[PDB]
């Protein structure tokens, strides 16, 4: 309970013990969570003094207090984090990584995590200051279980922030440096180390297929699928995001996910009570149905087509939109037999019900998939059966209303459908 004025008096006393006590008082202020006076500390000019205290190896308590106080300033807005970086804090924290006191180096890990967590530029600036070598050297043990639990959690989280963000993605040559340690943490039996490694892996698998392949040749897909079946939601969420990211790549990268048994988990995920899980799982299914015909057959074999029909029937609208994408990719790449099976599972009525939705893109996706199914019906000569089928569940009513509204592609596809099969 000091005032900022008193903290400034203690900091400028040029008395090391007074500075230590004022810095601890500043740390206590900055560590209350309902409105800490970050901007007041910054406007007082205390940040350069705090950074200079980081290098007083003779007084390790003032190192710890300054690190904690700077950590909490860097936890705020980008302007407040910039203030920490502008005071030269990055090379000082990187030096503290080599502190013989675990709590001090742990706090340097936390601070660096907050700075890299601000965005691409600060993450890249932390890497350019050489933080990766000493960070990974803290984990250079044969068995991670010998490390302190909170110590390990803090390193994993800071490493996940070095793998985070795009425009630009992290330097490949630093991802290569981090990946082996990341795989090691991914096999570590701690739910929060597991969750943070999965986040890191999900970040690294977002973007070009080259970066997807870079994660995949480390063998993490079986572990990702194992973690996909976890009961802890904070583990499944990033795990499913990583799996979903991987199946956006090549057909071989998608097959590696299928070969790991991932499809067996999806009856759970597609009926998950958490909305984003359902949405992510359905988006993943849409990208798997955009694969080869043998991969669409794997979806059929695992009995997931009734689950896709259910998501299309009753789900969050965002989830339903991903279901519409899954059906259009299915009907676009599937065999006539796979399409026949899809219609036999009862896809028509839930598909027609979403033609009244107030979203232009989903009508495009749905009307497209209707064209797809009709194109298969022509190879069976049974276009009349599909006509009466769309008849019998209020379908043509929707398509002849969609025949005339604003968007160009919808009514062009609408007139086409009407002239070609309903006359």
């Amino acid at each position: 309970n000091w005032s900022v004025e008193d903290i400034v008096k203690g900091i400028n006393s040029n008395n090391l013990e007074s500075q230590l006590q004022a810095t601890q008082a500043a740390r206590k202020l900055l560590s209350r969570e309902k409105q800490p006076p970050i901007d007041n500390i910054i406007r007082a000019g205390l940040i350069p003094k705090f950074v200079s205290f980081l290098g007083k190896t003779d007084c390790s308590p003032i190192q710890f207090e300054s690190a904690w106080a700077l950590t909490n300033i860097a936890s705020g807005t980008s302007e407040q984090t910039k203030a920490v970086v502008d005071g030269g804090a990055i090379p000082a924290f990187i030096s503290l990584l080599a502190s013989p006191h675990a709590h001090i180096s742990e706090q340097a890990v936390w601070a660096l995590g907050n700075i890299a967590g601000d965005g691409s530029a600060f993450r890249d600036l932390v890497i350019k200051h050489g933080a990766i070598d000493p960070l990974l050297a803290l984990l250079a043990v044969p068995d991670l279980s010998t490390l302190a639990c909170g110590y390990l959690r803090n390193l994993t989280w800071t490493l996940s922030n070095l793998c985070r963000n795009k425009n630009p993605a992290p330097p490949l040559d630093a991802v290569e440096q981090i990946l082996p340690t990341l795989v090691r943490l991914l096999h570590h039996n701690d739910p929060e180390v597991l969750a943070d490694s999965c986040w890191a892996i999900s970040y690294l698998t977002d973007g070009p297929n080259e970066r997807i392949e870079m994660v995949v040749k480390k063998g993490v897909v079986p572990q990702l699928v194992k973690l996909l079946g976890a009961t802890e939601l904070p583990i499944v969420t990033p795990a499913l995001r990583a799996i979903g990211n991987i199946v956006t790549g090549t057909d071989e990268q998608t097959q590696k996910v299928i070969d790991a048994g991932a499809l067996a988990v999806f009856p759970s995920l597609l009926t998950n009570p958490k909305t984003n899980i359902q949405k992510e799982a359905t988006w993943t299914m849409s990208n798997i149905t955009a694969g080869r015909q043998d991969q669409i057959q794997q979806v059929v074999n695992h009995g997931l087509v009734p689950f896709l029909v259910g998501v299309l029937s009753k789900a969050d609208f965002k989830t339903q939109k991903e279901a519409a994408w899954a059906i259009t990719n299915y009907t676009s790449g599937g065999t006539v037999e796979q399409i026949v099976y899809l219609v036999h599972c009862g896809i028509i009525e839930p598909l027609m019900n979403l033609l009244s939705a107030k979203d232009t893109k989903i009508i495009q996706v749905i009307l497209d998939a209707i064209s797809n199914i009709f194109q298969a019906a022509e190879k069976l000569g049974e276009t009349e059966k599909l006509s009466i089928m769309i008849e019998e569940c209020g379908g043509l009513d929707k398509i002849e209303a969609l025949q005339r509204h604003e968007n160009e592609s919808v009514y062009k596809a609408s007139l086409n459908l009407i002239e070609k099969y309903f006359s």
């Binding site: 206590k28 900055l30 560590s31 209350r32 936890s75 705020g76 907050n114 967590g117 985070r164």
Partner: peptide, 8 residues
Amino acid sequence: QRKRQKLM
């Protein structure tokens, strides 16, 4: 989730 402040 990006940033973490250390509390008492």
